[PDB]
């Protein structure tokens, strides 16, 4: 599923991401734009053999199982395929654990490089939340 900007903001709000760990909604929407261009089926292989999945490009190195990342962990206890669904529950719940792991949203390299410190409220401006 390819979400529209406001559709995803609303979805994320219902799922408890607004101000989760102090991160306002616009931060999560900005991150999803640059990680996946709002595409739930996005996947990208890393040079280390792990794979990023879903609208927030969660890495099989630590967070989900895909059966082909030797020596990896599965800290969200989910198949990585669950991160590709039109329904964002699995991605949101895993994101919550990730953002609570000590480094906040810096875990998302694209967030740190493209969203952090910017006017993130612009990503939700005009949206009926
Ligand atoms: Cl933080
Ligand atoms: Mn939902
Ligand atoms: Na894994």
């Amino acid at each position: 599923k390819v979400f529209g900007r406001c559709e995803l903001a609303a979805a994320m709000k219902r799922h408890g991401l607004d101000n989760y760990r102090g991160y306002s909604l616009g931060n999560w929407v900005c991150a999803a734009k640059f990680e996946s261009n709002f595409n739930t089926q996005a996947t990208n292989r890393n040079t280390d053999g792990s794979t990023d999945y879903g609208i927030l490009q969660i890495n099989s190195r630590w967070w989900c199982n895909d059966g082909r990342t030797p020596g990896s962990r599965n800290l969200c206890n989910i198949p990585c395929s669950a991160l590709l669904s039109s329904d964002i529950t699995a991605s949101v719940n895993c994101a919550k654990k990730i953002v609570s792991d000590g480094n906040g949203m810096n875990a998302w390299v694209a967030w740190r490089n493209r969203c952090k410190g910017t006017d993130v409220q612009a990503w939700i401006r005009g949206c009926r939340l």
Side-chain angles (χ1 to χ4, degrees), residues 49 60 121:
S60 64
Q121 203 179 353

Side-chain angles (χ1 to χ4, degrees), residues 50 59-75 78 80:
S50 64
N59 196 335
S60 64
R61 177 59 58 188
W62 305 286
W63 310 105
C64 62
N65 179 67
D66 62 10
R68 67 162 202 198
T69 315
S72 66
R73 284 293 321 116
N74 179 9
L75 297 177
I78 49 157
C80 297

Side-chain angles (χ1 to χ4, degrees), residues 39-58:
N39 190 357
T40 70
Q41 301 191 82
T43 63
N44 290 107
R45 199 78 189 260
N46 307 130
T47 85
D48 56 66
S50 64
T51 302
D52 296 344
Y53 296 85
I55 211 151
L56 293 171
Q57 292 289 276
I58 290 166

